[PDB]
Design a protein around this ligand. Structure first.
Ligand SMILES: [Zn+2]
Length: 196
RNA sequence: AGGUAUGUCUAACUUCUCUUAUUUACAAACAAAAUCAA
């Protein structure tokens, strides 16, 4: 569960840490220096991190820094769709555009009970800091998801591309987020999802 | 030769409740079984 990381003792006088918080004191137990909470096992440590308590102390420490100045029934065939990445350009910079194609009424003929069928594909930017394997990380992914088909990701080394500035005139139908409404199109008649 | 006089030149701002559950460690040289004319 430790994912092979080495947490140095508090007295070893600090290699960069994943979270520079959880330590081991003079004794063998694990502690959160901010929260000042002792934890028996790494599982308890992860409960602490996933707990609201630790988070509140993180926000308090950030304030100190500024001062110092449906999920169940989800069908899953895990089928990799076909993406068509292509370097785009407009004006005045460079942006990316993806063309994802979906089934041709091949298997979607057995499921038509208006169960989120009206819901279009959704995209989100995920940090690689969390993976099923947790080995390497440090870059973002433009994940795209649809109920039956399997998720898809696209690595984005560049810190920022096509991140525009008030493209439209501030109209508020949040849909899912500014990203989706701002720059996505869902040709539902042909089943083609464009993203740029 | 000496002395005097005159002139000219040259130098010098401090003292992290409750609740009900789950997770995980730990303590007590804690106790370990059988036999019974016990
Ligand atoms: Zn903490």
């Amino acid at each position: 569960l430790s994912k092979g990381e080495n947490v140095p003792y508090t007295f070893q006088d600090e290699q960069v840490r994943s979270n520079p918080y959880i330590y081991k004191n003079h004794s063998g137990k694990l502690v959160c220096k901010l929260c000042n909470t002792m934890h028996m096992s790494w599982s308890s440590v992860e409960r602490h991190l996933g707990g609201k308590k630790h988070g509140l102390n993180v926000l308090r420490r950030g304030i100190s820094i500024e001062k110092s100045s449906x999920x169940x029934x989800x069908x899953x065939x895990x089928x990799x769709x076909x993406x068509x990445x292509x370097x785009x350009x407009x004006x005045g910079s460079v942006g990316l555009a993806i063309q994802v194609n979906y089934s041709s009424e091949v298997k979607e003929n057995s499921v038509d009970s208006d169960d989120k069928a009206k819901v279009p594909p959704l995209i989100r930017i995920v940090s690689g800091l969390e993976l099923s394997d947790t080995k390497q990380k440090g870059k973002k992914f433009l994940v795209i998801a649809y109920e039956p088909f399997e998720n898809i990701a696209i690595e984005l080394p560049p810190n920022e591309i096509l991140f525009s500035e008030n493209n439209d005139m501030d109209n508020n139908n949040d849909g899912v987020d500014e990203l989706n409404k701002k720059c996505t199109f869902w040709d539902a008649i042909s089943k083609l999802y464009y993203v740029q």
